[PDB]
Write a protein that binds this ligand. Structure first.
Ligand SMILES: *[C@@H](C)[C@H]1/C(=C/c2[nH]c(/C=C3N=C(/C=C4\NC(=O)C(CC)=C4C)C(C)=C\3CCC(=O)O)c(CCC(=O)O)c2C)NC(=O)[C@@H]1C
Ligand SMILES: *[C@H](C)[C@H]1/C(=C/c2[nH]c(/C=C3N=C(/C=C4\NC(=O)C(CC)=C4C)C(C)=C\3CCC(=O)O)c(CCC(=O)O)c2C)NC(=O)[C@@H]1C
Ligand SMILES: *[C@H](C)[C@H]1/C(=C/c2[nH]c(/C=C3N=C(/C=C4\NC(=O)C(CC)=C4C)C(C)=C\3CCC(=O)O)c(CCC(=O)O)c2C)NC(=O)[C@@H]1C
Lengths: 172, 162
C-alpha cells in the first residue's frame, strides 16, 4: 500500500527525479499537521463500536425491509455479517485517514466489493446509506471542539469525508 | 511500500483490528523524526550533482582499472561513464526517497530487489557501489540527527551490497 509520502515518492520515481522544493514543503506541511490526524484516528477508533451500532440501528429503523423475514439482514448470521461489514469499512476508512491516502482502502476493501454484494444479493445502496451514517458520526466525534487544544481541522474533516464518500460510491 | 505508517496499518490489518495507541505512537515517532529526515533529504538533493560527481571519481580512484579496461561493463567509454554516473545518481535518489518516506521501502522495491541478479548478470562489482556510498557518507556535510538519518540509509545500501 501507500501513504501520502510513498505516493509522492512513487510518482517521482516513475519520472526518475528528485523531489522539488514544493514537494518537500507539501510533505513537510503534512508532518506539521500530524497531531490533528492522530487525534482524528484515535477519536474515531475509540468510538468505533458506538459509531457502527448507532448507524446500524438507524439504518434498520429507516429501512425496515432489511430486517423483515426474507430481508438481507434477517437471521443472526446475516445481521452479524452486516455489522461486520460496517466495522470493516470503518476500519479501512480509518487506515486511510492515518495514511493520508486512499490506497489501502481501495485495494484491500473496496476492490471487488460491488461485485461481491451483487453475487450475494446484498443491496449496495443500503450499505452506502450505512456508510454515510458512520461518516456523519465519525466527523462529529473527530471534530468535537471539547477536550482538545483548539484549532482548525476543516481540511482534515474534508479529507475524511472524502474517504467515506469514496467507500459509499464503491458499493452504491 | 515499507514505511512506518504502512507498516503500522499492515500490522492492524493482519490482526483484523482497528489501529490502536500502539500504532499511533509509532506514527508519531515517524512524524517527529521527519524533521531530521526531511533536512537530510533536502540537503542531499540540493547537493546531488556534486555528490554524484565526487562519488563517481572516488570509485574510479579506488578502482583505476574501471577507467581503462575494455568491456561494456566498465567506465572506459563515454557510454560506460554515463551508465556509472546514472547508477550512482539512482542510489542517491533512492536514499532521498527513503528519508522522505521514513523507511527503506523505496530502496527495497526500486533497487534492492533483484540487485544481486543484476550485478551478476551484467558483471558489475558490488565493491564499486560500496565505495561510491562510502564517499557520499563521508562528504554529505550533514551533522547531528540529520547526519544520523542519512547515514542509516546509506549504510543500509552498503549492507545490501555486502
Ligand atoms: C481536529 C481533529 C480537532 C483538534 C485537534 C488538534 N490536536 C492538536 C494537537 C495534539 N494532538 C495530539 C495527539 C496525539 N499525539 C500522539 O502522539 C497521539 C497518538 C498516541 C495522539 C492521539 C498531541 C500530543 C498534540 C500536542 C499537545 C496538545 O495537546 O496540544 C492540535 C494543535 C496542533 C498540532 O498539529 O500539533 C489541534 C488543533 N482541534 C480542534 O479544535 C478539533 C476538534
Ligand atoms: C449491511 C451494511 C448490509 C448487508 C451486508 C452483508 N454482507 C454480507 C457478506 C459479505 N460481506 C463481504 C465483504 C468483505 N469481506 C472482506 O473480507 C472484506 C475486506 C476486509 C469485505 C469488504 C463478503 C466477502 C461477504 C460474503 C462472505 C461472508 O458472509 O462470510 C452478508 C451475508 C449474506 C449471506 O450470507 O447471504 C450480508 C447480509 N446486508 C444488508 O442487508 C445491509 C444492506
Ligand atoms: C558505476 C559504479 C560502475 C559501472 C556501472 C555500469 N552499470 C551499467 C549498467 C546497469 N546498471 C544498472 C543498475 C540499476 N538499474 C536500475 O534500474 C537500478 C535501480 C533504480 C539500478 C541501480 C543496470 C540494470 C544495468 C544494466 C542495464 C542498463 O544498461 O541499464 C553499465 C553498462 C554495462 C553494459 O554491459 O552495457 C556500467 C558500465 N561501471 C563502472 O566501470 C563503474 C565502477
Amino acid at each position: 500500500m501507500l501513504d501520502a509520502f510513498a505516493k509522492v515518492v512513487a510518482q517521482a520515481d516513475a519520472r526518475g527525479e528528485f523531489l522539488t522544493n514544493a514537494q518537500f514543503d507539501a510533505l513537510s506541511n503534512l508532518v506539521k499537521e500530524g497531531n490533528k490526524r492522530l487525534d482524528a484516528v484515535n477519536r474515531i477508533t475509540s468510538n468505533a463500536s458506538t459509531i457502527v451500532a448507532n448507524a446500524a440501528r438507524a439504518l434498520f429503523a429507516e429501512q425496515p425491509q432489511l430486517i423483515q423475514p426474507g430481508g438481507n439482514a434477517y437471521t443472526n448470521r446475516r445481521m452479524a455479517a452486516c455489522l461486520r461489514d460496517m466495522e470493516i469499512i470503518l476500519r479501512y476508512v480509518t487506515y486511510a485517514i492515518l495514511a493520508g491516502d486512499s490506497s489501502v482502502l481501495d485495494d484491500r476493501c473496496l476492490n471487488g466489493l460491488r461485485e461481491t454484494y451483487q453475487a450475494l444479493g446484498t443491496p449496495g445502496s443500503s450499505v452506502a446509506v450505512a456508510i454515510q451514517k458512520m461518516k456523519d458520526a465519525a466527523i462529529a466525534i473527530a471534530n468535537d471542539p471539547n477536550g482538545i487544544t483548539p484549532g482548525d481541522c476543516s481540511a482534515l474533516m474534508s479529507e475524511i469525508a472524502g474517504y467515506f464518500d469514496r467507500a459509499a460510491a464503491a458499493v452504491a | 511500500m515499507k514505511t512506518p505508517i504502512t507498516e503500522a496499518i499492515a500490522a492492524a490489518d493482519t490482526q483484523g483490528r482497528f489501529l490502536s495507541n500502539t500504532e499511533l505512537q509509532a506514527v508519531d515517532g515517524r512524524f517527529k523524526r521527519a524533521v531530521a529526515s526531511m533536512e537530510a533529504a533536502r540537503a542531499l538533493t540540493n547537493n546531488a550533482q556534486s555528490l554524484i560527481d565526487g562519488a563517481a571519481q572516488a570509485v574510479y580512484q579506488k578502482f583505476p582499472y574501471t577507467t581503462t579496461m575494455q568491456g561494456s561493463q566498465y567506465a572506459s567509454t563515454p557510454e560506460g561513464k554515463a551508465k556509472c554516473a546514472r547508477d550512482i545518481g539512482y542510489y542517491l535518489r533512492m536514499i532521498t526517497y527513503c528519508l522522505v518516506a521514513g523507511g527503506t521501502g523505496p530502496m527495497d522495491e526500486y533497487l534492492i530487489a533483484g540487485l544481486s541478479e543484476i550485478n551478476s548478470t551484467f558483471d558489475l562489482s558490488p565493491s564499486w557501489y560500496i565505495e561510491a556510498l562510502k564517499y557520499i557518507k563521508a562528504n554529505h556535510g550533514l551533522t547531528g540527527q540529520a547526519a544520523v538519518e542519512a547515514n542509516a540509509y546509506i549504510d543500509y545500501a552498503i549492507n545490501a551490497l555486502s
